[PDB]
Amino acid sequence: MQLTDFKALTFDCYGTLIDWETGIVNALQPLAKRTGKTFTSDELLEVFGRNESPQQTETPGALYQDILRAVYDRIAKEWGLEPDAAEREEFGTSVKNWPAFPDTVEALQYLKKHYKLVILSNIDRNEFKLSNAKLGVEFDHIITAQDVGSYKPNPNNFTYMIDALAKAGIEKKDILHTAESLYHDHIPANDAGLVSAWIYRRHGKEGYGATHVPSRMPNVDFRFNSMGEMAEAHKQALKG
8 A cells, every 4th residue: 555556646636725714714814803893713612613614505506605604694693793895705705815735736746747636626616717827737627516416425425536637547455545534525436436535624623613613533555634745655665
């Protein structure tokens, strides 16, 4: 079991490559300021996660901005605030402001030299196009919840991706599914028979943050605390 055995990295984006937690914390600041309260980042992410998961209907909405706008309305209500139309508009379009993790671009640019790179996203294609401009590489394949007809962890998202990659020349055993979310990615990757690389982005933090809690702990074949550390492990494997 070696990193170099694989031909394609199939990525989660939001939480693995894009730091969506920092993006959400930043995007909630205008609304939070009106409460007069003081929130930690963990507290804001708890509020976001408790109010976003209900919006994850079985059939995906066409536009992720509609989820964010509905979340804004829910959070304004929870905080005893009246919603503001301009704040809602800015919050709903905020994916374009969500930053990459500081290590992501250099890691992706290295791994692009050696692997086919694929995206599996629950956030829609045009939002991901905005994030992609910050990620420093072109992705060979991009699969969204709108393509599949469901959100991960639905098994259809993984069979859709596996079939797409097979048609592109990548056998299932040559896929390494690389992602932070045990719930969204590694439980269904396990069930689908994929090998997993767990990027534990919250390794130095408490809890799951903006990420849904998993029903079980999945098996993972590789563990890294960052994308940069995955790239370093590949470099070390090639050196012997």
